[PDB]
């Protein structure tokens, strides 16, 4: 697994530890989407919400997916593409999330949804570029999407972040296939 | 908090 895939896992872990030690609210205060006008110039916050997980299922599921899909993208398409997929989804999912619901949310799953939509749609519309979501895994992705939508998980779900994330990934596979 |  490439460096981008790896450092993102590291960072999510460091952040998760920090959340267990200092508490969730303490870490949110530093990392959440700006929740006050004074924080508007704190540029990291438009991204760092992606780094926070609020339970062991949260971090574990998001990182397993990240590891696989993220790692696919990085090896077949390169580190640069994964960085750009990540920044775009993170920023866009974050924006839609806070519009609907407020600045209080976190998780790498806006981004994981981007990677699902991206890998699949690009494997459908662009097979030779080496990227596909195997039939079988598409089903488990599809169920993942569904669980989110219908609030199965037992978690409170960042609704905006999840769709925005998926759209972004589809939009990007679209744009990328047509070449 | 909303998860994601």
How many whole angstroms from its chain centre is CA A102? 18
Taking every pair of Cα atoms in chain A, the longest distance, rounded to a whole number of angstroms, is 48
- Residues in chain A within 8 Å Cβ distance of B3: 53-55, 58, 105-107, 109, 153, 155-158
The resolution in Å comes to 2.3
Q: Which two tokens stand for residue A5?
A: 């895939």
Q: What are phi and psi of A64, to 5 degrees?
A: -65, -55
CA gap A158, A162 in Å, rounded: 6
Query: Using the beta-carbon criterion (under 8 Å), do B3 and A101 form an inter-chain contact?
Result: no
CA gap A116, A29 in Å, rounded: 30
Specify whether A49 is catalytic.
Answer: no
Which method resolved this structure?
X-ray
Number of CB atoms found within 10 A of residue A24's CB = 16
- Residues in chain B within 8 Å Cβ distance of A53: 3
CB-nearest to B1 from A105, A109, A159 is A105
Identify which of A58, A16, A66, A62 has the alpha carbon closest to the alpha carbon of residue A155: A58
A110 Ramachandran zone, left/alpha/beta (phi>0; psi -120 to 50): alpha
CA gap A26, A65 in Å, rounded: 27
CA gap A26, A157 in Å, rounded: 21
CA gap A160, A105 in Å, rounded: 10
Domain range holding A84? 1-179
Q: Which residue has the tokens 């989407």?
A: A33
Among chain B residues, the shortest Cα distance to A149 is held by B4
CA gap A42, A38 in Å, rounded: 9
The answer to whether A154 and A104 are in contact (CB under 8 A) is: no
Identify which of A113, A96, A9 has the alpha carbon closest to the alpha carbon of residue A51: A9
The torsion defined by the Cα of A174, A70, A52 and A10, in degrees rounded to 10, comes to: -150
CA gap A155, A127 in Å, rounded: 36
Total domains in the fold of chain A: 1
- Beta-carbon-side half-sphere exposure of residue A133 (alpha carbons within 13 Å): 24
Coil, strand or helix at A170: helix
For chain B, say whether A129 makes contact (Cβ under 8 Å): no
CA gap A125, A107 in Å, rounded: 29
CA gap A89, A14 in Å, rounded: 21
Q: What are phi and psi of A44, to 5 degrees?
A: -60, -35
CA gap A128, A122 in Å, rounded: 10
Specify whether A109 is catalytic.
Answer: yes
């Amino acid at each position: 697994a490439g460096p981008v895939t790896w450092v993102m896992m590291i960072a999510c872990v460091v952040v998760f530890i920090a959340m267990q030690i200092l508490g969730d609210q303490e870490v949110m205060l530093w990392l959440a989407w700006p929740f006050d006008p004074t924080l508007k110039f704190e540029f990291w916050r438009y991204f760092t919400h992606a780094l926070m997980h609020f339970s062991l299922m949260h971090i574990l599921f998001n990182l397993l997916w990240w590891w696989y899909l993220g790692g696919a993208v990085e090896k077949r398409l390169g580190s640069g593409k994964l960085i750009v997929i990540t920044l775009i989804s993170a920023l866009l999912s974050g924006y839609v999330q806070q519009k609907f619901s407020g600045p209080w949310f976190g998780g790498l799953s806006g981004v994981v949804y981007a990677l699902m939509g991206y890998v699949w749609l690009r494997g459908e519309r662009d097979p030779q570029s080496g990227i596909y979501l195997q039939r079988g895994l598409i089903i488990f992705a599809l169920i993942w999407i569904v669980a989110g939508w219908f609030d199965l998980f037992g978690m409170s779900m960042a609704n905006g972040a999840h769709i925005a994330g998926l759209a972004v990934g589809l939009a990007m596979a679209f744009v990328d296939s047509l070449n | 908090v909303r998860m994601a």
